[PDB]
Ligand binder design. Structure first.
Ligand SMILES: NC(=O)c1ccc(Nc2nccc(Nc3cccc(C(F)(F)F)c3)n2)cc1
Length: 264
């Protein structure tokens, strides 16, 4: 509904990142409004032929509105790069939260998973699978709530896509890694992995090699440290089913006794 320009902003502190662009804290000059400016170089994009995933990323996040789904405001682009005007999440990533504490207690773990479910429950309702729920794509709002960002690798569902893969499978279901066709259940496997990683402090399928992990994932080989309670073990075991149709619906997850017992 309106076109901006790099001149309308005052870039600030580097929030971070790598490859195509660095996300900056920026300031809309007219309203003094705070936000994050994600800078992507065309040379990076073009050469990797991502044009469509950025057009997809920018189009979906372009509408979705949820408390837990980081907002995309619009964009613009000069000679050598494209800019994405994003919402700014005050508390950073959930990834640093985890490095910071090592592991989370059943309360945040129960909360993020809930917020995450309500978050996914929304995109699913619009046949939009995320397919990329790693803690690195999870941010925190000023109140500390989870906010799903980066809808790049996102697509509609059901889908068959096999896209030369990101480096890590750690968060992908047996169906996506095996190149096979998949649907919305793909985000439920991820939610299970993301839950385990929160409590144990490491992903359920972590290995040393790409091939080692792929083996561990496809045979769904995961064990529990002693401190993980039956309550969580249970939930994580219902999500980590090799066969998509056996994973729960997001209501059953928001209902799980363990989630209700510790979600604030
Ligand atoms: N290290 C801090 O103190 C810190 C980090 C991030 C933020 N907030 C924020 N909001 C929105 C976008 C964004 N970029 C960003 C950073 C890393 C990864 C990603 C990714 F795109 F991968 F999700 C985006 N970062 C605030 C403080």
């Amino acid at each position: 509904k309106r076109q901006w320009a790099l001149e309308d902003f005052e870039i600030g502190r580097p929030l971070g990142k790598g490859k195509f662009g660095n996300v900056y804290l920026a300031r809309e000059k007219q309203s003094k409004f705070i936000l994050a400016l994600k800078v992507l170089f065309k040379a990076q994009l073009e050469k990797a032929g991502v044009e469509h995933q950025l057009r997809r990323e920018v189009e979906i996040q372009s509408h979705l509105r949820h408390p837990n789904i980081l907002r995309l405001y619009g964009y613009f682009h000069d000679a050598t790069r494209v800019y994405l005007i994003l919402e700014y999440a005050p508390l950073g990533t959930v990834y640093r939260e985890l490095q910071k504490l090592s592991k989370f207690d059943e309360q945040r773990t129960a909360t993020y998973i809930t917020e995450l479910a309500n978050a996914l429950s929304y995109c699913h309702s619009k046949r939009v699978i995320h397919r990329d729920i790693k803690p690195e794509n999870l941010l925190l709002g000023s109140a500390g709530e989870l906010k799903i960002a980066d809808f790049g690798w996102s697509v509609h569902a059901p889908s068959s896509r096999r896209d030369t893969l990101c480096g890590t499978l750690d968060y992908l279901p047996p169906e996506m890694i095996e190149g096979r066709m998949h649907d919305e259940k793909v985000d439920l496997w991820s939610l299970g992995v993301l839950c385990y990683e929160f409590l144990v402090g490491k992903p359920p399928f972590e290995a040393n090699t790409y091939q080692e992990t792929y083996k561990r994932i496809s045979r769904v080989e995961f064990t529990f440290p002693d401190f993980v309670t039956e309550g969580a073990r249970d939930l994580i075991s219902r999500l980590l089913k090799h066969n998509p149709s056996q994973r729960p619906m997001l209501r059953e997850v928001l209902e799980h006794p363990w989630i209700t017992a510790n979600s604030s």
